[PDB]
From a paper:
Adeno-associated viruses (AAVs) belong to the Dependoparvovirus genus within the Parvoviridae family. Because of the broad differences in their tissue tropism and transduction efficiency and the absence of pathology, AAVs are the promising vehicles for therapeutic gene delivery. Adeno-associated virus receptor (AAVR), which is a glycosylated protein containing five polycystic kidney disease (PKD) repeat domains in its extracellular portion, was recently identified as a key proteinaceous receptor for multiple AAV serotypes to employ the post-attachment events of viral entry. To dissect the divergent rules of engagements between multiple AAV serotypes with AAVR, we select two AAV serotypes, AAV1 and AAV5, and solve the atomic structures of their complexes with AAVR by cryo-EM.
Meanwhile, the AAV1 and AAV5 particles alone were treated under identical conditions to obtain the unbound structures to identify potential conformational shifts upon receptor binding. The cryo-EM micrographs indicate the presence of AAVR on the AAV1 and AAV5 capsids, but at distinct positions. The final resolutions of the cryo-EM reconstruction were estimated by the FSC 0.143 cutoff to be 3.07 Å for AAV1 alone, 3.30 Å for the AAV1-AAVR complex, 3.18 Å for AAV5 alone, and 3.18 Å for the AAV5-AAVR complex. However, the structures of AAV5 capsomers with and without PKD1 attached display strict structural homology with an r.m.s.d of 0.27 Å for all Cɑ atoms from 519 residues, indicating that no obvious structural shift occurs upon AAVR binding. In this region, the conformation of the βGH7-ɑGH8 loop in AAV5 is more extended than the βGH6-αGH6′ loop in AAV2 and the βGH4-αGH5 loop in AAV1. Particularly, this part on the AAV5 capsid has a remarkable larger loop region shadowing the SIA binding pocket. There are two SIA-binding sites found on the AAV5 capsid, but only site A play essential role for AAV5 transduction. Notably, the structures of site A on the AAV5 capsid and the corresponding regions on the AAV1 and AAV2 capsids display high similarities. AAV5 is distinct among the dependent parvoviruses, since it was originally isolated from a patient sample instead of from laboratory stocks of adenovirus and has unique sequence and biochemical features.
Residue numbers in the entry:
A (entry chain A), B (entry chain A), C (entry chain A): 209 to 724
The structure:
């Protein structure tokens, strides 16, 4: 109500209630006045050698809230209690509240910055709940609610890239400009707040279980099939058959088949024997899209890398994360030790690997002059009767994504991971309202001389999750995530001497097992 | 409600109501923004020569309220009316209120500190009422509500020490990190307040009476016992007996026995004849605990020191206090005159002393070649039928303590003194919410450049105490605490020329007597 | 009702319902007619060199049901879901049913055993629910419901050892004989069953959490104590003091102390450097009890062995199990690899170790001719203010035990582990009723010529357990039990090529952590 009255409390709890959990999470944000309160037309040409990077777009003076990562809601213990006890989870509800807003005036006079504040400047927030803006949230960008609650993060500047012309920087006649002050906002002073609720649509549970049984080994090895296989041909042209025996799985008949595949290059981590002095951009997996050719990591769902205890990964197919956040616009060459290299190892009984071929088809029609030839294929798409296992979600990883507004789509699982929503959580845009300076005379040109200012405040996000409870009759103990460290020099998922929150390793979700 | 309206009054009264007393106490506090609003990993090795001092832990940017001393609630007169009229007291209720919060911005520009204030910055308070944090309150640390009401105290920085590995500074896999912004707080501006109530659980009354009768002298010295004692043996092997006479207490049969004991070293105060040039750390009483060996002062309840008018104390077994508060991290070598050396002299009819042996057992089996031998023991633990007298509480001393969350414990009286609570009064954590500076561009690294600020305000604590009234038929006058000073140069428990509140001597609670 | 009608179904399910779980478990048993249907007076002298082993007792023709092990109710997966999610469990109810009884006549004629059956022979069962018999169940003996449900176990023969005279085999006048046919039984034919219910009394939860914080390190390492310690003495006799600093835990004042202790010998497992050619029976920990001296493994609660990653254990203080069951009356010398050696490693922040001393007391009274001496003690019993951590329960370990019917006891936690019940689950005695042979004439001597026969059947036991749910705000992932094997040659807690259920390692219950 007033300036000397808090407009919201710090809620950062987490209440497990049966097959239901709410995870409140309050963080503190800073909004710099981006672009000095005006729109800019940003563009670029063929940088990094490729004309893929040429874009046309607009950068706004708006910041936005991007809590589309799992660590923004889950502590590493509450994540551990999730991934070791439940076979699924999905979001149900969402409740965001921006509160305790305070706006500061920085005045640089005589080499002395003076950060005062006014009780009069406003901050306008709106929520794009009709999806009329480019939804830039679910695309794996920075600027999120941090993993650690007393970290104060800055809000990322809202920009978007529209259509360009002929892979150049120049616009096209179909490229549109969206003014964000053409949306009804809510101008908030230092005693006002912004509540907002959201109910998720029915999405499937994230299948957070490892396969406890191979896909091609679903028959029992005791009784043998009543189906015969072609084995050979005699000295004449006549065919011969044998019974499909019990333990032999390389030749039984199968009901179900693995998912999609596209063969990627396999690179050795760890000890490693790799090719030396490699500039691997011209040999990676491209996917041309009306013009230029784009790298597409990670490749679509239905594959895996890192079989089991193998140092070979498919680095084109994995979700490499960093241990700490980095400076925006860095060119440092990181190594295997610095980065959190994701392994989808557990999904190998269902998914084919990415650094090998899937199988082989026929090449020629046989005759008594022509022996039958085969040939390995590097990519196989959807076949009727396929079954795959989607990409695992991680603590340091995205929660949802938006399906594009095209007419058609197939099986909307995001390739990076998470949930494919049709109407995702709306993008909370926020900016500082501009305050003019010392205008003494009238001029028809708009004001360019504003009071420089930022604004800070807190925000809370209350998620709600529906759990799929574990119902297994497995006898022996399962593998579960544990805090195993051979006398470390530091506690992990906890600060250090400086105060830097330190995450050493990624945390998956497939730890419990389940028979096919 | 608003900034120009006080959100709480100064209550510092004390209302004696029958067998019930409420002691309100308002103080004024200052909260420095510790660690510049971020967590730190603190650690240390084997300092002071001993690997006992090696710890691993975290220091928070939170301050806390620690009113766990008796002088924070009791004036020296209201304490005197307590200790001279009542045989017991225990806490019943508790009511804490933080009010009149105001937060100041210090700006050091051109060698000129300018302490302004904003009406917009918040302060978040929560109360750990589920005991999910390390309860660092009841362990005899500084930073309390002062003994004197117009003293303005600063809030102590909340830190805790978790498990370390192999007596080094390095962490272990079982050492946990608690983020305190993961608790639901209450962000308070300059017009808001924080009320909180608490009801104590049923604890025993503090037995605030001296024994008016010895424990081994509970028979009357007029009639003699109907029980005989072994006295000697004749020139043959035959045993002989005598009757237990009336006045003789060194050989009657006893029903009850003293409490626990561990023999400590006895050091002479006053005039004194002590060992010279002593480095007494290698000769003190250690108690090894999974690794290193810790000094444990004071040793557990059931002993005493300073018999009666003896300059010999057990300095390992007493509660030495200071006359005035000291600078944090001092290495001054204080003397007997500066310090308030506690004497548990009055509990000598029940408790054995600490600088002597308790008794003697048998050493050998006797025969007609072997005379019976004895041997003095230096420590005797709980025996069925024991009775002891717990440590006295003092005006300058702790009120409660928390029992640890292990499965088992025996007789939870804190060795330092006071009340052993299972669910103690919850620890009121409080910090300044961080205000960012002049962030002009987006970066994914968290904000490290905050506006430096502190916040002050008042706090009141209303205790409630249940009294055990004195019901004695003693004829002669009892000893009571009195203001006896042979024409002092200053009034005691009152300020001086500078304005320093001066306490010269400790004040016990056992002044009235009571027969066993 | 009839012989061609099953009198009970196979229930071996396990239903997790909130903070409550029922574990049904059906096994199949065989009852040999022990002693050929008559009582025997069994006795022994000082075998194995020690007169401790001399006993006097009686062996009955009764078998009994002994489901007092945790694997008899918990599959290794249902045990894993318990020990990784809950901070406690205790039994609430019990329901035993003996059903599908069938009794077989073996007839050895002309070197040809012919196992027929009659529909007429009975089997009598009763339940000792007034505790009038010696309760031989809770003492860690064989003959239990197996860990694996399709294992068919035989019922152990009920015997007991009464008082003997002067450590010989001869009886005493106070040694009593209990006839078990003097109890009202229930004679069951092949169409009858025996239902029985039992409600447990309120026992404490098993504290199934590791300490996440040391006992002597409960102060925070940031603020320092308001209590001073004796440090040394100057060149004169005068004492000197220092403040207890913050990080230093070897010299702060403590509120709580570890539990009981008796120093045992420490033997190195693993790589190991041990004494060679050892006959360690004359150097172990004995406890003399009215006559002879008994080994007492494991020593009472409040200690530990195996600090952390140390090959040294206290083999006198641990619960060594076997991988497979063994033949009754074996003398094989097993090794470290064959046996399941229990480690109580996680209870080291609270419990002192068993292969070291606990601390040191004072030895002499100091003076200026006598320096202060100390001395390490090997055993310390209950001290007021103690806190310990009881022995962990295991999957291959006992559930309950009976407190003896003496007048007094202290803290009835069984030293082997589990629950100390005053009225334990009653001992289900069962025997074959005797069937006489071909008696053709009258004689006053009783019949010694019976039809040799055994009887088999199924039994189910339905336990009910109350769970103490995990409520922690820990951030980082906890250590949990997992199925970790570096490509084993066999699945563990599962059969092998022969069909032998193979357990390789013991499973504890303290996996989650909890602050003190």
């Amino acid at each position: 109500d007033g300036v000397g009255n808090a407009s919201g409390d710090w809620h950062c709890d987490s209440t497990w209630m049966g097959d239901r959990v709410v995870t409140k999470s309050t963080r503190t944000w800073v909004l710099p006045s981006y672009n000095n309160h005006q729109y800019r037309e940003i563009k670029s040409g063929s940088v990094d050698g490729s004309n893929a990077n040429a874009y046309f777009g607009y950068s706004t003076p708006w910041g936005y809230f991007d809590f589309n990562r799992f660590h923004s809601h889950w502590s590493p213990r509450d994540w551990q209690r999730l991934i070791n006890n439940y076979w699924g989870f999905r979001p149900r509800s969402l409740r965001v509240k921006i509160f305790n807003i305070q706006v500061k005036e920085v005045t640089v006079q005589d080499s002395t910055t003076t950060i005062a504040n006014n009780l009069t400047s406003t901050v306008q927030v709106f929520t794009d709940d009709d999806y009329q803006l480019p939804y830039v949230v679910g695309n794996g960008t920075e600027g999120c609610l941090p993993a650690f609650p007393p970290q104060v993060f800055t809000l990322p500047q809202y920009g978007y890239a529209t259509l360009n012309r002929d892979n150049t920087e120049n616009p096209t006649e179909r490229s549109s400009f969206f003014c964000l002050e053409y949306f009804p906002s809510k101008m908030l002073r230092t005693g006002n707040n912004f509540e907002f609720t959201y109910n998720f649509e029915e999405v499937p549970f994230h299948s957070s279980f490892a396969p406890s049984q191979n896909l091609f080994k679903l028959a029992n090895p005791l009784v043998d099939q009543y189906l015969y296989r072609f084995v050979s041909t005699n000295n004449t042209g006549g065919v011969q058959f044998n019974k499909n025996l019990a333990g032999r799985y390389a030749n039984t008949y199968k009901n179900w088949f693995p998912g999609p595949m596209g063969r990627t290059q396999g690179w050795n981590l760890g000890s490693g024997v790799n090719r030396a002095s490699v500039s691997a951009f011209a040999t990676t997996n491209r996917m041309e899209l009306e013009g230029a050719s784009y790298q597409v990591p990670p490749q679509p769902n239905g594959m895996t890398n890192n079989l089991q205890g193998s140092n070979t990964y498919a680095l084109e197919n994995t979700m490499i994360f960093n241990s700490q956040p980095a400076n925006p616009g860095t060119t440092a060459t990181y190594l295997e030790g610095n980065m959190l290299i994701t392994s989808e190892s557990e999904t190998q009984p269902v998914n084919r690997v990415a650094y090998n071929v899937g199988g082989q088809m026929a090449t020629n029609n046989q005759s008594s002059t022509t022996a039958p030839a085969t040939g390995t294929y590097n990519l196989q798409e959807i076949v009727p009767g396929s079954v795959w296992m989607e990409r695992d979600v991680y603590l340091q990883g995205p929660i949802w994504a938006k399906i594009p507004e095209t007419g058609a789509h197939f099986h909307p699982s995001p390739a990076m991971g998470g949930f494919g929503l049709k109407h995702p959580p709306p993008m909370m845009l926020i900016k500082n309202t501009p305050v003019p300076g010392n205008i003494t005379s009238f001029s028809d040109v708009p004001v360019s001389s504003f009071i420089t200012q930022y604004s800070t405040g807190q925000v809370t996000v209350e998620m709600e999750w529906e759990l799929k409870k574990e119902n297994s009759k497995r006898w022996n103990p399962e593998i579960q995530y544990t805090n195993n460290y051979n006398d470390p020099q530091f506690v992990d998922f906890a600060p250090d001497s400086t105060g830097e929150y330190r995450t050493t390793r990624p945390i998956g979700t497939r730890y419990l097992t389940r028979p096919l």
